[PDB]
Design an enzyme around this catalytic site. Structure first.
Site, mmCIF file in Angstrom:
data_model
loop_
_atom_site.group_PDB
_atom_site.id
_atom_site.type_symbol
_atom_site.label_atom_id
_atom_site.label_comp_id
_atom_site.label_asym_id
_atom_site.label_seq_id
_atom_site.Cartn_x
_atom_site.Cartn_y
_atom_site.Cartn_z
ATOM 1 N N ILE A 148 0.798 -1.232 0.000
ATOM 2 C CA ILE A 148 0.000 0.000 0.000
ATOM 3 C C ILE A 148 0.832 1.285 0.000
ATOM 4 O O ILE A 148 0.311 2.367 -0.286
ATOM 5 C CB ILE A 148 -1.152 0.030 1.045
ATOM 6 C CG1 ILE A 148 -0.669 -0.245 2.483
ATOM 7 C CG2 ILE A 148 -2.302 -0.884 0.622
ATOM 8 C CD1 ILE A 148 -1.698 0.109 3.602
ATOM 9 N N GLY B 201 7.881 3.826 1.277
ATOM 10 C CA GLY B 201 8.748 4.954 1.598
ATOM 11 C C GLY B 201 10.216 4.599 1.767
ATOM 12 O O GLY B 201 10.629 3.471 1.463
ATOM 13 N N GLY C 73 10.868 1.819 4.580
ATOM 14 C CA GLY C 73 10.574 0.461 4.133
ATOM 15 C C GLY C 73 9.198 0.355 3.503
ATOM 16 O O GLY C 73 8.712 1.328 2.919
ATOM 17 N N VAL D 32 4.869 -0.782 3.544
ATOM 18 C CA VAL D 32 3.612 -0.815 4.284
ATOM 19 C C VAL D 32 2.650 -1.700 3.500
ATOM 20 O O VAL D 32 2.403 -1.457 2.319
ATOM 21 C CB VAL D 32 3.019 0.571 4.630
ATOM 22 C CG1 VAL D 32 1.715 0.430 5.405
ATOM 23 C CG2 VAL D 32 4.012 1.405 5.421
ATOM 24 N N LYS E 223 3.799 -2.338 8.798
ATOM 25 C CA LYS E 223 4.971 -1.541 8.441
ATOM 26 C C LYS E 223 6.232 -2.407 8.660
ATOM 27 O O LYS E 223 6.656 -2.600 9.801
ATOM 28 C CB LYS E 223 5.018 -0.237 9.272
ATOM 29 C CG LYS E 223 6.155 0.716 8.903
ATOM 30 C CD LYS E 223 6.289 1.824 9.922
ATOM 31 C CE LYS E 223 6.739 3.111 9.295
ATOM 32 N NZ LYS E 223 6.641 4.246 10.247
ATOM 33 N N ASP F 239 7.612 15.083 12.227
ATOM 34 C CA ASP F 239 7.138 15.053 10.841
ATOM 35 C C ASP F 239 5.633 15.158 10.679
ATOM 36 O O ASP F 239 4.997 14.247 10.145
ATOM 37 C CB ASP F 239 7.711 13.884 10.031
ATOM 38 C CG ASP F 239 7.779 14.159 8.533
ATOM 39 O OD1 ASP F 239 7.410 15.291 8.112
ATOM 40 O OD2 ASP F 239 8.273 13.283 7.790
HETATM 41 CL CL1 LIG Z 1 3.773 4.127 11.060
HETATM 42 C C1 LIG Z 1 2.750 4.330 9.691
HETATM 43 C C2 LIG Z 1 1.543 3.658 9.675
HETATM 44 C C3 LIG Z 1 0.736 3.850 8.574
HETATM 45 C C4 LIG Z 1 -0.592 3.313 8.438
HETATM 46 C C5 LIG Z 1 -1.339 2.911 9.521
HETATM 47 N N1 LIG Z 1 -2.579 2.577 9.062
HETATM 48 C C6 LIG Z 1 -2.671 2.811 7.722
HETATM 49 N N2 LIG Z 1 -3.771 2.614 6.985
HETATM 50 C C7 LIG Z 1 -3.560 2.904 5.694
HETATM 51 C C8 LIG Z 1 -2.383 3.358 5.138
HETATM 52 C C9 LIG Z 1 -1.272 3.536 5.938
HETATM 53 C C10 LIG Z 1 -1.428 3.245 7.288
HETATM 54 C C11 LIG Z 1 1.172 4.714 7.601
HETATM 55 C C12 LIG Z 1 2.396 5.344 7.666
HETATM 56 N N3 LIG Z 1 2.704 6.241 6.609
HETATM 57 C C13 LIG Z 1 3.015 5.642 5.306
HETATM 58 C C14 LIG Z 1 1.774 5.147 4.563
HETATM 59 C C15 LIG Z 1 2.149 4.540 3.224
HETATM 60 C C16 LIG Z 1 2.860 5.555 2.345
HETATM 61 C C17 LIG Z 1 4.052 6.189 3.055
HETATM 62 C C18 LIG Z 1 3.722 6.697 4.457
HETATM 63 N N4 LIG Z 1 3.196 5.164 8.735
#
Ligand SMILES: Clc1cc(-c2c[nH]c3ncccc23)cc(NC2CCCCC2)n1
Length: 324
Positions: free
Chosen positions: A26, A29, A32, A34, A49, A137
Site C-alpha cells: 500500500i 517509503g 521500508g 507498508v 509496516k 514530521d
Molecule cells: Cl507508522 C505508519 C503507519 C501507517 C498506516 C497505519 N494505518 C494505515 N492505513 C492505511 C495506510 C497507511 C497506514 C502509515 C504510515 N505512513 C506511510 C503510509 C504509506 C505511504 C508512506 C507513508 N506510517
C-alpha cells in the site's frame, strides 16, 4: 495465508498467534514497506509496516508506539520479527488525499471537517507532548482519517523522539513546507513547538486549498513566510537560533485568528496543543447539537485524561463542555 506469533502492542508480554491473508503493498517509503492485510479471524483490515532492524539498538519507533494509547493515534495491535513488523490499525484515507480531491475539484473542504480534523490533531499533539515526545514530521500524509466516522489518527513515529532540555537533536527532521523556521535556520535546541508550527501549516493549507509556505529551498520557504509573517525582529531571529488578506472572503475570523497564534516566529509565542484545542475556532464542536454532515455523531472529543490535561489542568473548564 501467513501465521505469526506476535507481541500485543500495549499490554503484558503474552504472545498471540496472528493469522492474515490478502497481503498487498500500500506504500513504499524510505523507511521500508507498508502492507495491507486481512486478519483471518476478525476479518478486520490491518496495515503492516516492515522496517529493517539493527541488533545494534532496540527500535525507537517501537519503543514510542508501545507506551502510546490515544483515540487520535494509530494502534500498534501486534509486532513481530523476520525485519521488525508493525501490525497497526488500517485507516482508509489521509488528509493529504482528501485535501487533494478538493483542490483538484477547485473547491475547499467544509469548515466543519477542518475544525474536526484540526482539533483531533491538536489532541494527539497534547497527548504525545505530555511525555516530552515530539513527532518531528507532521504533514497531511501522516494524518490518517476515516471519512464516515470523521476520526483523525496521527501516524509515523519513525522520526518521533523524546526531546530532553540541554540534549541537542538533528535539525534535518521534518518535511518541506511544514518545517518550522528554527529548523530552516538549522537550530538543534528546538522544542515540541515545531509540531505546533507544522500543525498550523496544515490548518492554513486546508483553509487556502494549497500549501501556505511552499518552496524547494529553505530560501524560497523563508520568503513565503516573510511575505505573510513580516520581517523577524533581531530578537525573533535570536529566539530561533496581512492575515485577513491571506485567506478567501467568507473564511471564519476565528480560523485566521488561530493561524496567527500558531504561525509565530518566536517558538515561545506559539499556542500549546491544549491551548489550541480550547480556541474559539473549535467552539462549534463544543455545541451539544453539533452533528456530522452525514447526520452521524461527532467522534469522542471530550474524554480528556489527567495525562492529556497535565500541560495546564484549568483548561478543562473550556475543554469539557457542560453537556459532559
Ligand atoms: Cl507508522 C505508519 C503507519 C501507517 C498506516 C497505519 N494505518 C494505515 N492505513 C492505511 C495506510 C497507511 C497506514 C502509515 C504510515 N505512513 C506511510 C503510509 C504509506 C505511504 C508512506 C507513508 N506510517
Amino acid at each position: 495465508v501467513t501465521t505469526v506469533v506476535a507481541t500485543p502492542g500495549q499490554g503484558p508480554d503474552r504472545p498471540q498467534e496472528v493469522s492474515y491473508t490478502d497481503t498487498k503493498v500500500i506504500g513504499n517509503g524510505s523507511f521500508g514497506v507498508v502492507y495491507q492485510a486481512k486478519l483471518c479471524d476478525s476479518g478486520e483490515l490491518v496495515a503492516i509496516k516492515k522496517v529493517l532492524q539493527d541488533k545494534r539498538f532496540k527500535n525507537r519507533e517501537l519503543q514510542i508506539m508501545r507506551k502510546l494509547d490515544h483515540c487520535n493515534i494509530v494502534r500498534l495491535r501486534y509486532f513481530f520479527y523476520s525485519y521488525l513488523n508493525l501490525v497497526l490499525d488500517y485507516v482508509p484515507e489521509t488528509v493529504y488525499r482528501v485535501a487533494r480531491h478538493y483542490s483538484r475539484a477547485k473547491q475547499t473542504l467544509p469548515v466543519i471537517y477542518v475544525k474536526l480534523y484540526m482539533y483531533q490533531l491538536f489532541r494527539s499533539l497534547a497527548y504525545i507532548h505530555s511525555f516530552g515526545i515530539c513527532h518531528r514530521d507532521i504533514k497531511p500524509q501522516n494524518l490518517l482519517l476515516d471519512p464516515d466516522t470523521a476520526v483523525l489518527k496521527l501516524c509515523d513515529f519513525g522520526s518521533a523522539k523524546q526531546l530532553v532540555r540541554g540534549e541537542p537533536n538533528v535539525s534535518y527532521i521534518c518535511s518541506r513546507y511544514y518545517r518550522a523556521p528554527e529548523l530552516i535556520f538549522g537550530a538543534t535546541d528546538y522544542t515540541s513547538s515545531i509540531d505546533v508550527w507544522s500543525a498550523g501549516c496544515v490548518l492554513a493549507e486546508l483553509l487556502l486549498g494549497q500549501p501556505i509556505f511552499p518552496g524547494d529551498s529553505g530560501v524560497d520557504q523563508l520568503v513565503e513566510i516573510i511575505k505573510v509573517l513580516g520581517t523577524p525582529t533581531r530578537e525573533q531571529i535570536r529566539e530561533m537560533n496581512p492575515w485577513t488578506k491571506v485567506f478567501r472572503p467568507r473564511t471564519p475570523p476565528e480560523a485566521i485568528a488561530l493561524c496567527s497564534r500558531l504561525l509565530e516566529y518566536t517558538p515561545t509565542a506559539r499556542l500549546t496543543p491544549l491551548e489550541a484545542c480550547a480556541h474559539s475556532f473549535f467552539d462549534e464542536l463544543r455545541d451539544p447539537n453539533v452533528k456530522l454532515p452525514n447526520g452521524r455523531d461527532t467522534p469522542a472529543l471530550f474524554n480528556f485524561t489527567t495525562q492529556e490535561l497535565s500541560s495546564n489542568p484549568p483548561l478543562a473548564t473550556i475543554l469539557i463542555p457542560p453537556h459532559a
